[PDB]
Amino acid sequence: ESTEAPWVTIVWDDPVNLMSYVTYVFQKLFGYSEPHATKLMLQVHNEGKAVVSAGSRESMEVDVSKLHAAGLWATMQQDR
Template identity: 35%
Template sequence: MVLLNDDYTPMEFVVDVLEKFFGLDRPTATRIMLEVHTQGKGVCGVFTFEIAETKVAQVTTYARD
């Protein structure tokens, strides 16, 4: 899965999502967040389509709450 940078999502929220939904530790989540922030995108994992789809739904619901 690839995360894309935007002008709205706080960096700490991205780190939180990477820890909660992708099982990453804080240093790894922070590294990926900084890559997304500076490069415009970053890989947060490789998953089957079904798992990726579930993660998108979970993160979207979490972001809206």
């Protein structure tokens, strides 16, 4: 198949960061509203991970880097 396909950024639950911090980071880095950021934070915390953004591989690479700088456990993968 082709490599021009969409990717996602995933945040993984970590035992150190405050829930309030994670909500704030999603608002700050992605411009998300409070209800949206809180829902994603709670999904990370209750499911162990959440897709937080989606787009091209190169765009997701930026989101991962931004999240790492904020101290969050982020990875990216191709979306199937």
